[PDB]
Design a protein around this ligand. Structure first.
Ligand SMILES: Nc1ncnc2c1ncn2[C@@H]1O[C@H](COP(=O)(O)OP(=O)(O)OP(O)(O)=S)[C@@H](O)[C@H]1O
Ligand SMILES: Nc1ncnc2c1ncn2[C@@H]1O[C@H](COP(=O)(O)OP(=O)(O)OP(O)(O)=S)[C@@H](O)[C@H]1O
Ligand SMILES: Nc1ncnc2c1ncn2[C@@H]1O[C@H](COP(=O)(O)OP(=O)(O)OP(O)(O)=S)[C@@H](O)[C@H]1O
Ligand SMILES: [Mg+2]
Ligand SMILES: [Mg+2]
Ligand SMILES: [Mg+2]
Lengths: 319, 49, 339, 147, 39, 50, 261, 164, 261, 261
């Protein structure tokens, strides 16, 4: 009777339903099929399917013994120095009977939140006990993991999902959930989720639960981003070097309450796929990045935004 | 070549880098230190990055 | 620890004979009593009434009414006899590290309710001040206990929440109040409070507030009790904002006279009014788009003032930056005037 | 053992700062009522704002309770406003009983003299606003700036 | 190892006689590696 | 049908099977050979005493 | 304007070491019926309900209803230097912000006057009606203490199931699951107490280890304790004090999910 | 093992191993990767330094481990693989195991005398570049030719982002 | 299915109390002959070989000769709960990941089922070969305990010397010697106190004292202890628990840095 | 040639743990009569007097009056290596620059000789008025210790008011005033125990809490302690070591102010 969220209702249960990162998922498929998995560290942006991949790999490796031979430690658990000293080492020393080629799996999700002392301790208990237990860790920023674990693991790289893949799985969810839609809503959802399947599914469920129809207007009424047509008209006026209309639209955006950060983010995201010349795109990107670092450093007012607008306008009128 | 290397200098100088360079030592090729061993305490970072 | 009793009886604490807290005088009570963001409130009430309430992310500029809104939702969803057994509210005042997520949050989200069966609610005020690892634990607490309890995160800046915590929730922005529907609140309070005010006072009140009622009422009562009358001059004196006539005279000096006389007059007025260069730059920037300039002049002025507002942040000598601000206009528009 | 010259010949009480007429008058009116409101002094450096507020603190309190009941802080702390807010919270939470043999008991509010208040970002400024509103009737704030 | 609790009193009272004395088992299974630990 | 990581599957049993750092491993091997000679000499002295 | 006399300080020191870190702030409500304590854990997972009569006191007298609260750290720290056999006095005014624990002499030599500062915190009466329970059993304090020590000593989740045969205390932990079975026919020899059952339908529930451990700090209040557990109503650990009053301990069970197919 | 790693639970570890230093009759060995621990520790000990091994020798050994698992390959790919890992033998061996046991990346024949098909392309999958590009595409082939389509631009941006 | 029934649980409690801080983990090899526990210590200087034959148990059934390894910290924390007059059941399957200890308490129905997990021990079975020892001493165990105490105050190393009149336990110290001579006390009332020496030839070896104290802490298990000592072999300290089995302690001698002439 | 011999090694450990923090440089004054300590606290608020006579020592020798200064952290590390039952010799020379602490072996293990430095900054001559006190009281040591530990959690200053009824240790602070009174005799397991008072007039004074916290560490010095307290002269908390000598700690009161109007 409970509405399971479409993130958890339509999570993949096999490794052949994962879209994106075809080579790494194919290697995970062959390692789930044959066995003898190495200690893996999967790194990538949020939402690309790392936890789902390691869960499906653990399930396909273990089977009925998944309740006994798998120990899962997320960021919501303790994962302290004494936890690594006692619980993980005791699970590694535990005797579990498994078929040939199958080892126990200690999943450690979000190794970024693992403190450096716990990693320093986890080195040797990862090293010696590899005859019976195996380690599958996952992170976003692999630099937060100390170098000894990266030495003790195999580093698998996850990339941002290409828009075709997120479109295909969005269509799969829609055809399995009879969602009424138009192609404008598809483009709006793909825009609001930059290679993030979790954000796309959550936004789609939110607009279908809110308004019941999938078009651009409803999606930007629920996601509530600065509208990409307004930002496209900004960039188009600045291509023509019309500072008056561009500042008119940006004053409209500013008076709607959008922060400097997501305004310059949306300007960059629209400007990346804008239809103009390569050199003008390069200079536009350079000035956008300069202004974005100015917003990052702490100065974030309307004056900086309009100054970037003036620089983008003057890059056209000056050779 | 000069134009490209000018944009590359622009990218290093007036664009933010992902990981904050010279965070624990100074810039490369220096003999002050650079043997920055990783952390050794279980207390969390609590940083405001 | 604690820190809730002081606020809890700080809100009903007044002299009631002499003090006049006009901000606390007019407060919303329920969803039908917050006359703003009707789409958001109707959507949240429809989510509640269908028992399809998802994880909420209430974000926006402060003073727009997020916490009172979710308090109204919590009071309407659960009665007073089971409010403490079903609603868990936390702020950033009780910050001891990342153990707040593994403490009350993880224990409360991992058990049923006690007395009356139902889904519980977690309210987290100021969630952007939470560290990245504490939020990385809060997303897992959200993921594994989404059926039993729902999470409502109130924050001020959306960028400081991780993409996963955003992607587990639906986002609702409390935007600023359009000045129109804001003005009826001001005329209601002046008609109740018997205050002398002109239309320039209303323009100043809707300009400095930039879409809020709390600081608007603060400015209004402060100017009223300090002067007895509310006009453009008295408001910008009580607030201590750059007066429009002063910025107009600054622009006149930069646009008519030579370098040195303009420099001396501007420096004299700056030390006379205590007016910084950042606020001069902001108000002159607002002034530039109103005064009819050519496109190239407008572009050049905007670029130069953006550069000066960047240079002022790193902490140089403001005297040299002020003289360069004068130079930015002397280069183009006084040359065109001489032409 | 000795003190620097700048803190030595500053005026001991109010009305001894020259060239100011109405500021010291309103300060004396506030001190006669034994209630200093939240105070903001702006002016160029080396003018006497710090001298005036320190003289007012010495006049309203006793010299033996002068240092114990005021707290000088700067807003340019490198660790954000969390350390500043925790210092203000610690100072406002601690209460020291005082007695003056001159004949006037000490007022209950404590004094936080905060310098360089104009070097403050808007988020930190709103945090300071909510901190001052939390301690409205127990601690009266002093803000020193040029702009 | 660092994975084990290695405090001063534990390591001396559990491993001093490894250095000060002989091995009771000297023939047979001796190429095996006791990783010192205390629960 | 293998249940070993390649680090331990191809674990060097002898120090001569190691690659690189030749001076270091010969120094270590000479030091440990001298310690073995000392232990054997101690056992010889114990057998001579009794 | 409230006053109270207490025959022994042992009852108070035991009821206060029962709730050291379980309860952040202790707020007693006063009435002509008696002294009451409706408190709820800061993590909002467990509740304590201490109801003591007026006649169990030496002399009880009130003038008006009032609920006063004290920080439990200070209320604990003043007690560690207490005489267990001492008569004690609790005193407050109608609108004063201070509560006085007038201490008599544990060594026939001293009169002490301690004051504690109240705080101004909201308190709402958690109006639970007395509903029926599917399984009501009795269990000694020492045995229940030992078994809670042993179970939280091995595992991190005390799984208690009440059936017709007895009460099964299980603990499935990382080290290895320990299961304990009591019975109706069993009676201990340490205090000569018999586990008797009033079973109606079999019920299985899971609770946190630490919170039961904190609940189980209350052994010297009563010789025996009552476990009341229903299929939906949370766990009740109830100590009945000899002529003094009654104590009630509510703990909501953990989340357990259906195993996927 | 890893003597430089001291926690607050390891109370007085250094004094304990100094007592072990003084009162031993059996060999005592210390292993640490921290160069500063040679300075901080106070005691008499024989110092042995392991330098970074030569790239070509370890590359030949890794090619060799590949041969004994009946795959042939080239030297240069393990050279850049070693360069990316800073000549770390453990990381290279583990990634080599993961890479060989996944069945190979690219089947290209390269007749060299100095026969089965070569298995070049290890460093490309090491950096995750095969998740960005088609298996027909090569890195330098993509980089040398002119980029015109939107998908090639996205591939270029994702490659540069993965390296940034 | 491995099934063992300890008729009296105190003996197993006592042997774990004798070796609680000595050995890291207990490995059991079980066959039709009975339970054997040949546990190395972590410094690998002492080995405990405790044998309990099949006929000493009430019930016994093994279908396959097996070996398990359990950490003795867990095996120490379990057995505090048991009484001194009861029976113990050790249950395991032919291929299982756990072993169950079942305690039937002296109540009518109170069953404790502690299912302890098995650690995957890598160390194979370690034992010394059988050999005749030149010096055999039959001697009271508690009198060994008091000698071990006296030398434990005096020193930490014993240069024990066997002579025809008995064994002399000589300490080493800068100024303090704990030289305690033992003579023939065979003509005495109780055969446990009576000391008989069957030594072939004298031999001199040095031993640490903490391990001797740990070995002699098992004095109430057996009335008397046999001491087996010979050249270049570990010292054997053997206790015979009458009708339940026999336990042996193998303690290695200290090495000697002999100086050349 | 200075050689003092102490009959028990626990005396230095129990007198010196008090001197761990209050004194920066401890200067022994040796003469024909015995050993004197005139310790001058670095805050210029407290004094410590120790008189240790020769007849308490088993052996004591002296040729000329000397003063030896030892830094506070320099002997605390060297005293923990000496047991309580060890028999200690303090040895100093006339013109040399080392102080030798020769401990008897811990249960005849090995003789431990430790060396340190005896250079004093100055003799630091100080005069004691040998004044007469209006309040002298015999009261247990452990009672004062638990009074100090109870009032320590409140604040940093403690006010005492000695009257003919009894003493009243009071400590007002941030949380609440704590008050302990001592009157007439006391009922303990022993037959005789009393806070006995001989006194002229009631006086009250306020003191710093932390200084009494460092004099608290001299608790095992005696079963009971002496309190001398009067209108102006500093408070004496005097410990007798039976035949050894005596110890007297002075601390200056914190003066209070009265409102003129
Ligand atoms: N490649 C994918 N194919 C199909 N569904 C996906 C994919 N990636 C994400 N999803 C969906 O998104 C949900 C959440 O993905 P997760 O794996 O939890 O994200 P993540 O990779 O773990 O990154 P985190 O958890 O934010 S660090 C899954 O349950 C799927 O429903
Ligand atoms: N839409 C509104 N109309 C009128 N008054 C409002 C409105 N929103 C907020 N207020 C006022 O603000 C008070 C509380 O608002 P808050 O919920 O604190 O604002 P906020 O959006 O949560 O931002 P914070 O709390 O400063 S982070 C109310 O009692 C009102 O006095
Ligand atoms: N009008 C005045 N009357 C008396 N003393 C003065 C006057 N103007 C300046 N001073 C003295 O000048 C010195 C410096 O002034 P301060 O008040 O300490 O600092 P300031 O004027 O606030 O400038 P800051 O603190 O750098 S912003 C002090 O010793 C003052 O007593
Ligand atoms: Mg995840
Ligand atoms: Mg709010
Ligand atoms: Mg100043």
């Amino acid at each position: 009777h409970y509405e399971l969220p479409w993130v958890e209702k339509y999570r993949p249960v096999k490794l052949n339903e994962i879209v994106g990162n075809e080579d790494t998922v194919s290697r995970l498929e062959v390692f789930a099929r044959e066995g003898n998995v190495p200690n893996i560290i999967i790194a990538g942006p949020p939402g690309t399917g790392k936890t789902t991949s390691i869960l499906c790999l653990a399930r396909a490796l273990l089977g009925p013994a998944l309740k006994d031979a798998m120990l899962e430690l997320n960021a919501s658990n303790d994962r302290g120095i004494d936890v690594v000293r006692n619980k993980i080492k005791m699970f590694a020393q535990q005797k579990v009977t498994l078929p040939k080629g199958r080892h126990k799996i200690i999943i450690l999700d979000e190794a970024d939140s693992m403190t450096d002392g716990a990693q320093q301790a986890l080195r040797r208990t990862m090293e010696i006990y590899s005859k019976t237990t195996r380690f599958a860790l996952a992170c976003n920023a692999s630099d937060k993991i100390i170098e000894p674990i990266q030495s003790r693991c195999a580093v698998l790289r996850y990339t941002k999902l290409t828009d075709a893949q997120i479109l295909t799985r969005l269509m799969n969810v829609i055809e399995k959930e009879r969602v009424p839609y138009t192609d404008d809503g598809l483009e709006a959802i793909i825009f609001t989720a930059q290679g993030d399947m979790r954000q796309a599914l959550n936004n789609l469920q939110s607009t279908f639960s809110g308004f019941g129809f999938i078009n651009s207007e409803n999606v930007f009424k629920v996601c509530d981003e600065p509208h990409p047509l307004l930002v496209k008209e900004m960039i188009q006026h600045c291509v023509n070097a019309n500072i008056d209309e561009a500042y008119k639209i940006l004053a409209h955006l500013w008076h709607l309450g959008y922060s400097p950060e997501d305004i310059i983010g949306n300007i960059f995201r629209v400007c990346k796929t804008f239809q103009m010349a390569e050199y003008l795109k390069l200079e536009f990107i350079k000035e956008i990045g300069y202004t974005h670092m100015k917003i990052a450093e702490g100065v974030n007012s309307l004056l900086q935004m309009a100054g970037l607008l003036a620089r983008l306008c003057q890059k056209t009128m000056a050779p | 070549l000069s134009e490209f290397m000018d944009n590359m200098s622009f990218l290093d100088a007036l664009l933010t880098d992902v990981r904050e360079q010279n965070k624990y030592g100074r810039n490369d090729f220096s003999w002050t230190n650079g043997k920055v061993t990783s952390g050794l305490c279980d207390e969390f970072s609590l940083e405001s990055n | 620890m604690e820190t809730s009793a002081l606020k809890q009886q700080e809100q009903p604490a007044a002299t009631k004979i002499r003090n006049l807290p006009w901000v606390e005088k007019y407060r919303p009570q329920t969803l039908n009593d917050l006359i703003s963001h009707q789409d958001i409130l109707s959507t949240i009430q429809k989510f509640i009434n269908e028992d399809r309430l998802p994880h909420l992310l209430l974000y926006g500029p402060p003073g727009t009414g997020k916490t009172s809104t979710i308090l109204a939702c919590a009071k309407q969803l659960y009665k007073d006899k089971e409010f403490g057994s079903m609603v868990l509210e936390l702020n950033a005042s009780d910050d001891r590290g990342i153990d707040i997520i593994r403490g009350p949050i993880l224990s409360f989200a991992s058990t049923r309710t006690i007395f009356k069966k139902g889904f519980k609610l977690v309210i987290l005020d100021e969630a952007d001040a939470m560290t990245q690892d504490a939020q990385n634990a809060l997303r897992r607490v959200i993921e594994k206990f989404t059926e039993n309890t729902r999470f409502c995160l109130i924050c001020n800046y959306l960028s400081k929440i991780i993409p996963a915590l955003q992607s587990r929730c639906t986002r609702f922005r409390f935007g600023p109040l359009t000045p129109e529907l804001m003005v009826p609140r001001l005329e209601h309070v002046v008609e109740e409070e018997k205050v002398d005010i002109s239309e320039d006072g209303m323009k100043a009140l809707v300009t400095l507030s930039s879409g809020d009622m709390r600081r608007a009422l603060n400015i209004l009562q402060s100017t009223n009790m300090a002067f007895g009358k509310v006009t453009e001059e008295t408001v910008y004196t009580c607030t201590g904002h750059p007066l429009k006539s002063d910025i107009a005279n600054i622009l006149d000096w930069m646009l008519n006279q030579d370098f040195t006389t303009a420099y001396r007059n501007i420096t004299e007025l700056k030390t006379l009014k205590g007016l910084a260069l950042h606020d001069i730059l902001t108000e002159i920037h607002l002034f530039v788009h109103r005064v009819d300039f050519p496109s190239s002049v407008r572009i050049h002025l905007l670029t130069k003032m953006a550069d000066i507002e960047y240079r002022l942040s790193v902490g140089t000598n403001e005297k040299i930056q002020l003289s360069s601000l004068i130079a930015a206009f002397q280069v183009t528009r006084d040359l065109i005037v001489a032409e | 053992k000795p003190v620097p010259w700048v803190e030595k010949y500053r005026p001991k009480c109010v009305d001894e700062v020259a060239f100011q007429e109405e500021v010291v008058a309103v300060l004396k009116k506030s001190l006669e009522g034994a209630d200093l409101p939240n105070l903001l002094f702006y002016g160029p450096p080396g003018t006497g704002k710090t001298s005036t507020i320190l003289a007012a603190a010495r006049e309203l309190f006793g010299p033996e309770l002068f240092r114990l009941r005021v707290l000088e802080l700067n807003a340019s702390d490198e660790r954000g406003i969390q350390v500043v807010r925790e210092k203000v919270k610690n100072f406002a939470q601690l209460t020291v009983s005082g007695s003056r043999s001159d004949g006037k008991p000490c007022p209950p509010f404590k004094i936080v003299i905060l310098d360089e208040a104009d070097s403050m970002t808007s988020a930190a400024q709103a945090a300071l606003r909510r901190t001052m509103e939390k301690e409205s009737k127990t601690t009266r704030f002093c803000l020193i700036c040029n702009y | 190892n660092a994975s084990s609790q290695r405090s001063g009193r534990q390591i001396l009272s559990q491993l001093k006689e490894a250095t000060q004395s002989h091995q009771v088992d000297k023939q047979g299974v001796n190429s095996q590696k006791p990783c010192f630990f205390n629960s | 049908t293998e249940d070993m990581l390649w680090t331990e599957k191809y674990q060097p049993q002898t120090a001569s099977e190691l690659i690189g750092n030749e001076l270091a491993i010969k120094k270590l091997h000479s030091w440990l050979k001298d310690w073995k000679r000392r232990a054997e000499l101690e056992e010889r002295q114990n057998l001579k005493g009794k | 304007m409230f006053e109270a006399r207490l025959v022994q300080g042992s009852i108070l020191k035991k009821v206060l070491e029962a709730l050291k870190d379980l309860i952040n702030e202790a707020c007693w409500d006063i009435s002509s019926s008696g002294v009451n304590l409706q408190s709820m854990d800061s993590s909002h997972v467990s509740l304590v309900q201490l109801t003591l009569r007026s006649e169990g006191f030496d002399t009880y007298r009130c003038d008006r209803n009032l609920a006063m609260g004290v920080n439990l750290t200070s209320m604990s720290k003043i007690l560690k230097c207490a005489g267990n056999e001492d008569i004690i006095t609790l005193r407050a005014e109608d609108n004063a912000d201070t509560l006085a624990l007038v201490f008599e002499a544990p060594n026939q030599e001293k009169v002490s006057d301690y004051e504690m500062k109240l705080m101004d915190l909201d308190v709402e009466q958690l109006g639970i009606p007395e509903q029926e329970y599917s399984c009501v059993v009795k269990m000694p304090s020492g045995e229940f203490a030992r078994i809670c020590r042993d179970l939280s000593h091995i595992g991190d989740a005390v799984v208690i199931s009440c059936a017709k045969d007895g009460v099964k205390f299980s603990a499935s932990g990382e080290l290895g699951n320990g299961n304990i079975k009591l019975s109706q026919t069993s009676n201990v020899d340490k205090e000569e107490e018999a586990v008797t059952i009033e079973m109606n339908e079999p019920v299985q529930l899971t609770f946190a280890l630490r919170y039961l451990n904190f609940f189980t700090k209350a052994t010297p209040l009563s010789s025996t304790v009552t476990l009341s557990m229903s299929a939906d109503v949370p766990l009740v650990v109830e100590y009945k004090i000899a002529d003094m009053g009654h104590l009630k301990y509510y703990l909501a069970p953990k989340i357990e999910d259906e195993e996927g197919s | 093992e890893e003597v430089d790693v001291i926690f607050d639970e390891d109370a007085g570890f250094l004094n304990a191993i100094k007592t072990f230093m003084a009162t031993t009759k059996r060999p005592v060995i210390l292993t640490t990767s921290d160069p500063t621990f040679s300075l901080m520790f106070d005691g008499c000990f024989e110092e042995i330094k392991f330098s970074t091994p030569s790239l070509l020798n370890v590359a030949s050994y890794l090619q060799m481990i590949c041969l004994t698992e009946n795959f042939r390959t080239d030297v240069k790919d393990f050279v850049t693989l070693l360069t990316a890992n800073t000549c770390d033998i453990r990381k290279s061996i583990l990634y080599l195991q993961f890479w060989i046991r996944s069945g190979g990346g690219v089947l290209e024949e390269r007749p060299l005398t100095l026969l089965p098909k070569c298995d070049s392309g290890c460093a490309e999958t090491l950096f995750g570049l095969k998740n960005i590009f088609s298996p027909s595409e090569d890195l330098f082939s993509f980089l040398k030719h002119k980029i015109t389509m939107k998908e090639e631009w996205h591939k270029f941006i994702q490659l540069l982002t993965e390296f940034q």
